[PDB]
Chains A and B, each alone.
Chain A
Amino acid sequence: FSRILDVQPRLAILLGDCAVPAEGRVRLLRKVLERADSTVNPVVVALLS
């Protein structure tokens, strides 16, 4: 997921606007993550959340 994220910086920077209320970012994050859940673990979801 590191590889997944950093070479896609346009959405990586998106998860960076701290001025946005915080949930907003993970709000999008879950949107992409369980976009399909072959991120087969939930602990990973909790950590990066």
Chain B
Amino acid sequence: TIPADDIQSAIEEYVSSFSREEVGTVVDAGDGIAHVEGLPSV
């Protein structure tokens, strides 16, 4: 006895219910080198 349902748009709803602009928050800096968190599409 198994939920062999596999309603896939159950998954569709979740992921595609997800504009502005990616902005990186400087995490640490020094000596001319900077690490930047965020910006998933650089």
Question: Cβ of B3 and Cβ of A14 under 8 Å apart?
Answer: no
Residue in B closest to A8 when the chains form the complex, CB atoms: B6
User: Which of chain A's residues has its CB closest to B13's CB?
Assistant: A31
Tally chain B residues at the interface, Cβ within 8 Å.
11
Please name all residues of chain A whose beta carbon is closer than 8 Å to the beta carbon of B3 when the two chains form the complex: 4, 32-33, 35-36, 38-39
B14 touching A24 by the CB < 8 A rule? yes
Instruction: Say yes or no for B21: interface residue by CB 8 A criterion.
Output: no
7 residue pairs, one from A and one from B, having the closest CB atoms: A28-B14, A32-B10, A31-B10, A35-B5, A11-B11, A36-B3, A35-B7
Interface residues of chain B, those whose CB is within 8 Å of chain A, are: 1-3, 5-7, 10-11, 13-15
**30 sample A-B contacts, Cβ–Cβ < 8 Å, listed by A number:** A3-B2, A4-B2, A4-B3, A8-B6, A11-B11, A14-B11, A14-B14, A28-B10, A28-B11, A28-B13, A28-B14, A28-B15, A31-B10, A31-B13, A31-B14, A32-B3, A32-B5, A32-B7, A32-B10, A32-B11, A33-B3, A35-B3, A35-B5, A35-B7, A35-B10, A36-B3, A36-B5, A38-B1, A38-B3, A39-B3
